[PDB]
Amino acid sequence: TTDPCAPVKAFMTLANMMVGFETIPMDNQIYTQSRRASAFSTPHTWPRC
């Protein structure tokens, strides 16, 4: 896909898979680790880890 947020969707898909196994520092408490990976689609919303 020509979506520029394809790598962050690929990373957040695994981070949604692994909830409770391993925890990562997210940006805030809104866009958490267990939030669906679809919603990002924006460079402001890329997690800092």
Partner: protein
């Protein structure tokens, strides 16, 4: 925070302890970093934040 301009100002103890505890627990510590440097007293920043 640059050290050379923030060398001689007192830091906030609650934000420091909560920042260490949030970083060791991976619990979205980035919204504590603006509260780390204190002003007008130690307690009123936490009240009026």
């Amino acid at each position: 925070y640059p050290i050379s301009t923030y060398n001689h100002d007192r830091v906030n103890v609650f934000v420091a302890n909560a920042l260490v505890g949030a970083f060791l627990s991976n619990q979205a510590f980035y919204d504590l970093l603006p509260l780390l440097i204190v002003n007008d007293t130690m307690i009123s920043d936490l009240l009026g934040t």
